[PDB]
Paper text:
TRPV3 is most abundantly expressed in epidermal and hair follicle keratinocytes where it plays a key role in the maintenance of normal skin physiology. In contrast to other thermoTRP channels, TRPV3 sensitizes, rather than desensitizes, upon repeated stimulation with either heat or agonists. The TRPV3 channel, like other thermoTRPV channels (TRPV1, TRPV2, and TRPV427–30), is a fourfold symmetric homotetramer. Each monomer contains an amino- (N-) terminal cytosolic ankyrin repeat domain (ARD) and a domain-swapped transmembrane domain (TMD) comprising six transmembrane helices (S1−S6).
To elucidate the conformational changes governing transition of TRPV3 from the closed to the open state, we determined structures of the channel in the presence of the agonist 2-APB (TRPV32-APB). A single cryo-EM dataset yielded three distinct conformations, TRPV32-APB 1, TRPV32-APB 2, and TRPV32-APB 3, all of which resolved to ~4 Å resolution or better. Strikingly, two out of the three TRPV32-APB structures exhibit twofold (C2) symmetry (TRPV32-APB 2, and TRPV32-APB 3), deviating from the canonical fourfold (C4) symmetry previously associated with thermoTRPV channels. The reduced symmetry is conspicuous in the pores of the TRPV32-APB 2 and TRPV32-APB 3 structures, where movement in the C-terminal region of S6 in diagonally opposing protomers results in asymmetric gate arrangements within the channels. In TRPV32-APB 2 the distance between the M677 residues in subunits A and C is ~5.7 Å, similar to the diameter of the closed gate of apo TRPV3 (~5.2 Å). However, in subunits B and D this distance is increased to ~9.1 Å which is similar to the ~9.3 Å diameter measured between gate residues in the structure of TRPV1 bound to double-knot toxin (DkTx) and resiniferatoxin (RTx). However, TRPV32-APB 2 is likely to be nonconductive, as the narrow opening of subunits A and C constricts the pore. It is thus possible that this arrangement of subunits represents an intermediate state. Interestingly, an overlay of S5 helices of subunits A and B revealed that their S4−S5 linkers contain π-helices that originate at two different positions: at residue I583 in subunit A and at residue M578 in subunit B. Since the π-helices dictate the angle between subunits, it is likely that the differing positions of S4−S5 π-helices within the tetramer are responsible for the twofold symmetric arrangement of the channel.
Author numbering:
A (entry chain B): 276 to 462, 484 to 508, 518 to 756
B (entry chain C): 551 to 688
C (entry chain A): 689 to 756
Write the structure that this text describes.
Amino acid sequence: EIVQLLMEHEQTDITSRDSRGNNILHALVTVAEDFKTQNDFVKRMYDMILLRSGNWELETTRNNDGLTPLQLAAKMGKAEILKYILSREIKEKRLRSLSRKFTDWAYGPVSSSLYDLTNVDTTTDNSVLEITVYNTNIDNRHEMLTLEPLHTLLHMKWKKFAKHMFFLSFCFYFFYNITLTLVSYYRLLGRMFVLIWAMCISVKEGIAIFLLSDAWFHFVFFIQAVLVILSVFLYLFAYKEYLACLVLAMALGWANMLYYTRGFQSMGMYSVMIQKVILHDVLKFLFVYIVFLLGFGVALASLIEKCPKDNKDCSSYGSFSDAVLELFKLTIGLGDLNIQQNSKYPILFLFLLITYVILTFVLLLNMLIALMGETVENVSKESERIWRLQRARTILEFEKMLPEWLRSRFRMGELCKVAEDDFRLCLRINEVKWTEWKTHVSFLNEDPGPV
Amino acid sequence: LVLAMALGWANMLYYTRGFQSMGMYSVMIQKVILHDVLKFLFVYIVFLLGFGVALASLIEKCPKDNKDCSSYGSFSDAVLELFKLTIGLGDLNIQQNSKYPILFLFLLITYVILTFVLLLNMLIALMGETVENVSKES
Amino acid sequence: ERIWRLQRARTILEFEKMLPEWLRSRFRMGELCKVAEDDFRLCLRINEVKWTEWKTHVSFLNEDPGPV
């Protein structure tokens, strides 16, 4: 009521930017915490204020940061307000311009909604899409992407070219790794292309990391390329030994191949499960297990510190590294076990060695508990939100790798006419609604024909 | 003939599908082998090749005509040793017929770790859907 | 999680008991505040936010909402 009173006065200045430069709309976007908290009233005030001023000025302006209110809601973790903005259908014939969501035709429950892509597509300097995707500050990007226009843009771009580009890069990397394997196993015409590709990806990864738990793979590729260039430079020198590092990069290369399983749906979910959760858990598991290994191997080597007496087979665990290897054998089940000689207390030796096994077993059971507990519900949704998010990030990466003229050629979206003699980009999406029935007063085209 | 025998005794499982308990049993077999196991097998074959090439490369050091000295000599031999290891039958030991025991051991340990983690993720992906969808779908 | 929080509180109290009087006096959490009728007592501050329950705030110690 007070807002109505204020807007009715002619002395009022709706367009007044504060010291920070923000309009009313930027401010409201700075406040939309979530639905469970507010009960979604700020959206109502946004709508009312727009309807009080039939113009584009408020949404067009920028703050001192240089961002529209839309770009601002994308910058923050603000979804409901964005869902509203990107989907506005105003029945008022006079204020039809302000709407972004348009119904081209509604013969019945089937109808083609015509969304708008003025500052949403990647054509602008900073699109809503790049803003949503290239910020890890929010931790809500999945709820941001599931919206109609952005979701459809991403999947249509994947349908057009990005699938081809990803398969292309995967084929190149597959060829590269096959060449590396052939070179290493049997150790010139192929090695040249290998080295050139290595230097290319080295420069790429270096630049990307200079620009920089998602970017780990960049460091992985960088390490692989560094190892490859190092081994190839050392090869020129008369050093047979240096070549030993080659297989290391090869092994690392195969880890990089895991990255490309991120593409397929099932394989992608499986790969994210490989990457994140298992890292988080098994890294701590491995750290504690290694400290156990050291703490027990030192003791065992100390007990068996007794002299061998011209018998090395009697000196099992004799070397500390040898003792660690023997416990590795034991936990896996490789090492022939027996009551060790050269121990003043063989019974206590065996007791400690069995306590090792019991501790390792209960430790395995602990990690199993942690994994099965996390795997219930958090893993599914988290892995989906990570997978689709990384896919969209890489889609935009491929799109940025391109030049201007090709992008122009593609031209996602169709130019279309909106009332009041306007022409703008739009996106057509066919959708059905059985629950709601109504006379479609707001329709762009009388004839529901597709063409 | 013998192959058929094997396949034949894999086919009796079919008739187990009659019983309700054995019915859900066989259907769980089918669903798991279709969904989770193929991923494990494929990517594990990938790792087998990626690591066995390197193992054979290091084992390229000639044993002077002694297959026992330079274990992991043949590529298929190294893969068989890796299989025994993942089952635990092998008799591992630092091979004097090698230029680098340190790198050999580190790579073998990383292989074992990766295999264990991959098996573990197979188990996790199983448990994830285990509770809700399995019973009803079966 | 319950046992974790519980044992962490136990440890915190143990370490607090390990300290001397003067360091404890230094790390005293809370602040003196005037409540009512020449009453000065210790208090703990928590800034809270509520978007649901709307009401004209009648009862308040300080007229100016400034932190200091």
